[PDB]
Amino acid sequence: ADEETGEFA
Amino acid sequence: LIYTAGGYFRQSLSYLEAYNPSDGTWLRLADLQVPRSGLAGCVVGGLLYAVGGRNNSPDGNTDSSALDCYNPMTNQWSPCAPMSVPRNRIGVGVIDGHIYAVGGSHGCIHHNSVERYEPERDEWHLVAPMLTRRIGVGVAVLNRLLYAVGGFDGTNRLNSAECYYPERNEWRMITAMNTIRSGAGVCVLHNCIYAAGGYDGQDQLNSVERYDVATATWTFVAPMKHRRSALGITVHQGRIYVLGGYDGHTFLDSVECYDPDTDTWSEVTRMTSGRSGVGVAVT
Amino acid sequence: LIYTAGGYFRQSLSYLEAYNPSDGTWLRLADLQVPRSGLAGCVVGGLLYAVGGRNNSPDGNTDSSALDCYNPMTNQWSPCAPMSVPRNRIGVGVIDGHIYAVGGSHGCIHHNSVERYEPERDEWHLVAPMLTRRIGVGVAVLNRLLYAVGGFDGTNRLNSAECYYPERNEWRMITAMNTIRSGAGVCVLHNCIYAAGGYDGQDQLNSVERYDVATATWTFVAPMKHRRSALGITVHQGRIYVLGGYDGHTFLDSVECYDPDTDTWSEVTRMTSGRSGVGVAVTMEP
């Protein structure tokens, strides 16, 4: 997960 | 009412939902035709525009160059001309009925370019680029100047802010924020530029600070209850609302509202579902 | 003369050398007591001070709180009272005959602390901390105000700058630079702050920009010939000198000189050996 948005990589 | 479009929870979303701060109800309308997260929302001529973003799905991860228009009486979306480049985690502002699309990423390219859309000609055209590459950039318009605030350049998260002057097509650096903020909510409440939350590269933030133009000074105000980056933000009836976001572990449904007279935050709403990266606007 | 103290080349170095811009000569002087890189230099009352830094040796790796004093009349070093904490990749400025020690690191600690040294009592005292933790920070003094420019907070490299008002004891953010820079050379020439080179997290930089207080604006000037981070910098007779640094492959010996009247850089000399992280300042000649 993106540390800022939560979206998968 | 305040419309939230798109967002992300396990995949990009097509939700278009409207919040009533009077009734406290949520009203759900037509789905976006293409799911989008990391997009930005604005309103021109009562029409709601959804700009950039990305479709992060089990079968793809496509950065969007699209611009889509929702009409509140028609309850229907209509495509408009697309931007020059796709812009995920874009920022947008509105001046003189024109749409400014700011920064964002396409793949690993972090844009410094800016372009402007005019709704009655259905056209985009590039303007002067920012001095900084910025994704996750907060955008605001005050005294009909365009501010790009914080973000991420590909390597460093930023506390710098810069100002765009429409009648010279030039960007000027201004005083930097006290806090590095990528993916913050940035709006113009009353007459200060407000930057709430975001991510500084190690922690999501609940601090909020505001820029006072006359003194060129950033000042800390009421900190948000719950840390959040990739949040939606808008101003209703002279008070600011922040919706959803990500806090490092969970996708938030919390909606907080700031009263500027009391200088106090607390929880006004749950969204119907937790999510981050929405585009928020009011009409 | 232009004095360069310490620096780094696979080991911290103890060199004190002084360049004569007229002669072309490098003079070899008394060694630093301890090899140090990432230190700063400055001059108060004609004495040359070497502040902070780090001893990188084949037998050890220790940051340094030391303050040491060099006298060109005697060609001797003398220790001074040390800072409250070690400060590697420090920035230093001088106000009213007092030395301000700004930022730096100690292990994994990235300082926002700032402290002031008084030569006539050999004492350090802490002052208000910066708004930002800044290592590899550039420091400059303009109209008796202390500016901390750029740097690295441990996570993000910085283009922000902030300004310290001594007799109000508080820091205030100012307009950020156009370019993110850690380990830049920062000095004052005429009535502007120059920030030159450094590292932005991807490239070493040859660009140079200057802050005018009257307009609160960072405007770009001519870039240097060689990209360089962790360079030394000083002003000699109305001209900027940058010494050594690191370009991602090589520890540089080149010394460039900026003439503000022509907005031109040129290469004037090479140091006796390439190195980064030096302390540089100007005083009489021994």
Three-state SS string across chain B, please? CEEEECCEECEEECCEEEECCCCCCEEECCCCCCCEECCEEEEECCEEEEECCEEEECCEEEECCCEEEEECCCCEEEECCCCCCCCECCEEEEECCEEEEECCEECCEECCCEEEEECCCCEEEECCCCCCCCECCEEEEECCEEEEEEEECCCCEEEEEEEEECCCCEEEECECCCCCCECCEEEEECCEEEEECCECCCCECCCEEEEECCCCEEEECCCCCCCCECCEEEEECCEEEEECCECCCCECCEEEEEECCCCEEEEEEECCCCCECCEEEEC
B106 forms bridges with which residues in the sheet? B109
CA dihedral sign of residues B136, B140, B145, B147: negative
Contact B276 A3 (CB under 8 A): no
C-alpha distance from B109 to closest chain C C-alpha (Å): 14
Whether the CB-CB separation of C264 and C222 falls below 8 Å is answered with yes
Å between B119 CA and nearest CA of chain A: 30
- DSSP string over C36-67: -BS-EEEEETTEEEEE--EEEETTEEEE---E
Resolution, rounded to a tenth of an Å?
A: 2.3
Query: Does the distance separating the beta carbons of A5 and B37 come in below 8 Å?
Result: yes
* Residue whose token pair is 């503000």: C260
Closest CA to C166 of C187, C149, C145, C148: C145
Order of all β-strands in the sheet with B264-270: B232-236, B239-243, B254-259, B264-270
Q: What is the DSSP string of chain C?
A: -EEEE--BSSSB---EEEE-TTT--EEE-PPPSS--BS-EEEEETTEEEEE--EEEETTEEEE---EEEEETTTTEEEE-PPPSS--BT-EEEEETTEEEEE--EETTEE---EEEEETTTTEEEEEPPPSS--BS-EEEEETTEEEEE--B-SS-B---EEEEETTTTEEEE-BPPSS--BS-EEEEETTEEEEE--B-SS-B---EEEEETTTTEEEEEPPPSS--BS-EEEEETTEEEEE--B-SS-B--EEEEEETTTTEEEEEEE-SS--BS-EEEE----
Q: Which of the residues B130, B152, B163, B173 would you substitute to probe the C interface, choosing the one with the greatest number of C C-beta atoms within 10 Å?
A: B173
Nearest CB neighbour to B201, from listed C155, C159, C178: C155
Cα–Cα distance measured from residue C225 to residue C126, given in angstroms and rounded to the nearest whole number:
39
Torsion of CA C172, C176, C181, C184, to 10 degrees: -60
Give the closest-approach CA distance of A8 to chain B in angstroms. Answer: 8
Residues of chain B neighbouring A8 (CB-CB closer than 8 A): 56, 61
Retrieve residue B75's tokens. Answer: 């309850």
- Position B148: which residue type? A
Q: What are the chain C neighbours of B128 within 8 Å (beta carbons)?
A: none
Residues of chain A in contact with residue B55, where contact means CB-CB under 8 angstroms, are: none
**DSSP type of residue A3:** T
How far from C233 is each of B129, B147, C4, C55, C197, CA to CA, in Å? 32, 34, 9, 21, 10
In angstroms, the CA B233 to CA B241 distance is: 6
B251/A4 CB distance under 8 A = no
Residue of chain C minimizing CA distance to B130: C178
CB contact burial C125-146 (16+ within 10 A = b; e otherwise): eebebbbbbbbbbbbbbbeebb
On the 0-12 / 13-18 / 19+ scale of CB atoms within 10 A, B245 is buried
Chain B residues 192-211 with CB within 8 Å of chain A: 199
Widest CA span of chain A, in angstroms? 11
- All residues of chain A having their beta carbon less than 8 Å from the beta carbon of residue B248 are 3
Cβ pair B230:A6 closer than 8 A: yes
Instruction: Count the domains in chain C.
Output: 1
How many other C-beta atoms are found inside a 10 Å radius of the C-beta of residue B14?
16
Sequence-distant (6+) residues with CB within 8 A of B135 are: B88, B89, B90, B103, B104, B105, B110, B111, B151, B152, B153, B154, B182
Residue B89 Cα distances to A7, B86, B139, B241, C284, angstroms: 12, 10, 11, 19, 56
- B-interface mutation test, from C156, C158, C178, C199, most B Cβ less than 10 A away: C156
Q: How far is residue B115's CA from residue B67's CA, in Å, rounded to a whole number?
A: 12
Instruction: Read off the tokens for C271.
Output: 């140091």
Name the closest residue on chain B to residue C155, using Cα atoms: B201
Residue B195, token pair as written in the block? 């930057």
| Residue B200: closest C-alpha in chain A | A4
Q: Return d(Cα C25, Cα C59) in angstroms, integer.
A: 33
Distance from CA of A5 to the nearest CA of B (A): 5
Rounded to 5 degrees, φ, ψ at C95 are -135, 125
Token couple for C250: 């090589």
CB contact under 8 A, B175 and C180: no
Instruction: Say if residues B81 and B123 touch (Cβ distance below 8 Å).
Output: yes
Technique used to solve these coordinates: X-ray
Please, which residues 185-214 of chain B have a Cβ atom closer than 8 Å to chain C?
200-202
Q: Is-contact C103 C111, C-beta < 8 A? A: yes
* A7: DSSP letter: -
Greatest extent of chain B over all pairs of C-alpha atoms, in Å: 50
- Contact between B227 and B256 under an 8 Å Cβ cutoff? The reply is no
Are A7 and B182 a contacting pair at CB < 8 A? no
Radius of gyration for the alpha carbons in chain B, expressed in angstroms and rounded:
17
Closest residue in A to B228 (Cα) is A4
Which residues make beta-bridge pairs with B123?
A: B118
**Scanning every residue of chain A, which has its alpha carbon at the shortest distance from the alpha carbon of B152?**
A4
Contact A5 B251 (CB under 8 A): no
| Chains contacting C (3+ CB pairs below 8 angstroms) | B
State which H helix or E strand residue A1 sits in. none
Three-point CA angle B217, B219, B225, nearest 5° = 155
Token reading at B100? 């400014």
CA distances in angstroms from C62 to B61, B243, C34, C86, C87, listed in the order given: 47, 48, 11, 9, 10
Task: Compute the distance between CA of residue B132 and CA of residue C180 in angstroms, rounded to an integer.
Answer: 9
Q: Count Cα atoms within 13 angstroms, Cβ side, for C103.
A: 32
- Show which subunits contact A, needing at least 3 CB pairs below 8 angstroms: B
Q: Does B176 touch chain C (CB under 8 A)?
A: yes
d(CA C234, CA C56) in angstroms, rounded, equals 24
List CB contacts of C216: < 8 A, sequence separation 6 or more.
B216, C174, C175
Separation of alpha carbons C55 and C63, rounded Å: 6
Instruction: Measure Cα distances from C194 to C18, C141, C179, C213 in Å.
Output: 23, 11, 12, 12
Cβ distance of A3 and B199 shorter than 8 Å? yes
Q: Which two tokens stand for residue B276?
A: 């981050």
Nearest to B173 among C153, C176, C202 (CB): C176
Residue with tokens 């009592």: C121
Contact present, C137 and C103 (Cβ < 8 Å) = yes
When scoring B109, B110, B160 by the number of chain C Cβ atoms within 10 A, the one with the most, hence best to mutate, is: B160
What's the CA gap between C97 and C116, in Å, rounded?
10
C 83-112 residues with CB < 8 A to B = none
Q: Are the C-beta atoms of C142 and C193 separated by less than 8 Å?
A: yes
Measured CA to CA, the distance from residue C195 to residue C207 in angstroms comes to: 9
Nearest 5 degrees, angle CA C236-CA C241-CA C246?
155
CB B109 within 8 A of CB B89: no
Q: Whole-angstrom Cα distance, residue B68 to residue B48?
A: 8
The verdict on B56 touching A (C-beta cutoff 8 Å) is yes
What is the separation of C-alpha C87 from the centre of its chain, rounded to a whole number of angstroms? 12
Distance CA B173, CA C220 (A): 13
| Smallest CA–CA distance from C178 into chain B, residue | B131
Does residue C101 contact residue C83 with C-beta atoms inside 8 Å? yes
Q: Residue B273: count other Cβ atoms within 10 Å of its Cβ.
A: 13
CA–CA dist C241, C236 (Å, integer):
7
Query: HSE of B36 in the Cβ direction (CA atoms, 13 Å)?
Result: 31
Domain of B2, in residue numbers? 1-283
Tell me how far apart the alpha carbons of residues C252 and C47 are, in angstroms, rounded to a whole number. Answer: 27
Tokens of C76: 């001797």
Which of A2, A3, A4 is the best substitution to test chain B (most B C-beta atoms within 10 A)? A4
- Encoded tokens for B45: 């001529």
**What is the C-alpha to C-alpha distance for residues B174 and B155, in angstroms, rounded to an integer?**
21
- Determine the 3-state secondary structure of A4 from DSSP: coil
For B267, the token pair is 């929880």
Residue that has been written with the tokens 């040796």 in this structure: C57
Chain B residue with Cα closest to C161: B176
Min distance B36 CA to chain C CA atoms (Å): 29
CB C79 within 8 A of CB C49: no
The whole-angstrom separation of Cα C52 and Cα C68 is 9
The verdict on B133 touching C (C-beta cutoff 8 Å) is: no
DSSP state for residue A6 in the 8-state scheme = -
